[PDB]
Subunit: 116 residues, 4 copies
């Protein structure tokens, strides 16, 4: 698992469950092409997005559909979504965890990049 996404809810102190996440890779013509997607699990996690073979160096965008999440809870949110845009770099073996901490009018995102 080279790429994992974790989403947490700072209003309820809980994982953010059933949040849609879309991953895109930047193509040669500068457009964002779909790469992977899914919904966070009961633990707020989305695993199984990609494989080492597929996850080549490039610019990726992770879009987290925060608005739908807050609307399902009845809470008016600020953002349309949260976006995390980054370059994947081969620099020895690497695993990326993209975490997002959600509030209605704020989010924080962190990247944890480790070498198994």
């Amino acid at each position: 698992c080279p790429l994992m996404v974790k989403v947490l809810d700072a209003v309820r102190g809980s994982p953010a469950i059933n949040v849609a996440v879309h991953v895109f890779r930047k193509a040669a013509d500068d457009t964002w092409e779909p790469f992977a997607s899914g919904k966070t699990s009961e633990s707020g996690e989305l695993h199984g997005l990609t494989t080492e073979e597929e996850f080549v160096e490039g610019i990726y965008k992770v879009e987290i559909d925060t608005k739908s999440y807050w609307k399902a809870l009845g809470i008016s949110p600020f953002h349309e979504h949260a976006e995390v845009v980054f370059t994947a770099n081969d620099s020895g073996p690497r695993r990326y965890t993209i975490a997002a901490l959600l509030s209605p009018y704020s989010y924080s995102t962190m990247a944890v990049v480790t070498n198994p």
Copy 2:
């Protein structure tokens, strides 16, 4: 201002100075049209991006060019940029302060919305 951006540097404990910011507005054909741009001042603030008249209802994207900021300080950061996407003015004119707190592998963004 109807729209102000504030950027802080969590490594130095200081405003993030000379940070480029680009604002886009979603057009009718679903593309991102350039709306306004500028650079943060010595206070980390960017004022004067738009006017009440020009800042109509819409979906806006504020793109903060964090990678360029970090690289100039000798840090190879994770993100390409910090992006903030939001519907504005859809219940009438509001004032928006978009704040970002930057670290090399993390950022936080908060919006303060006020009714004039």
Copy 3:
């Protein structure tokens, strides 16, 4: 001010108004002596806590009474308070802005330190 505190509410997208703040300074016997206190204004800001003369070198604690804030808005929050503990002025007088961004189960705090 040599010391200013700013508190924001990430649920409402607004300043956190009427938030009690208590400042303490570590005394020679290792106890926390009361130093200054106040409440945030309608801008979420608390000014006028101390003076350059009184704000000597020391270890200071800024305690932000977040639980009381949340409870008054109908939220049962996680934290008792947000605490910020720091050495101040140990290479001469500085100005400190202590910012806090509040959610019910999370907060962020950032310090901006400037040399007058």
Copy 4:
């Protein structure tokens, strides 16, 4: 494991390893008594602090020695430590994860409270 602490480093995009953590419980005389302590693992995690039997309702403080961590990396930090103060509440079965995201001049903390 009713109580777990996770510490992340936002400057390096990594777990924060070998960080000292101390847990205290508030005693009847309002003083903080040592409860549990340890050092974060290679994954930034500290497990095994307490047991269900021991971890009774009360006010707890988790102190994370951030200053020592940044000093070991050569990075000048703002905070003496990070503190997380909270009430444990029996409200059905409960597990607490206290996460901290560290930068030199900022930290964020989040509590994830779940029911196995």
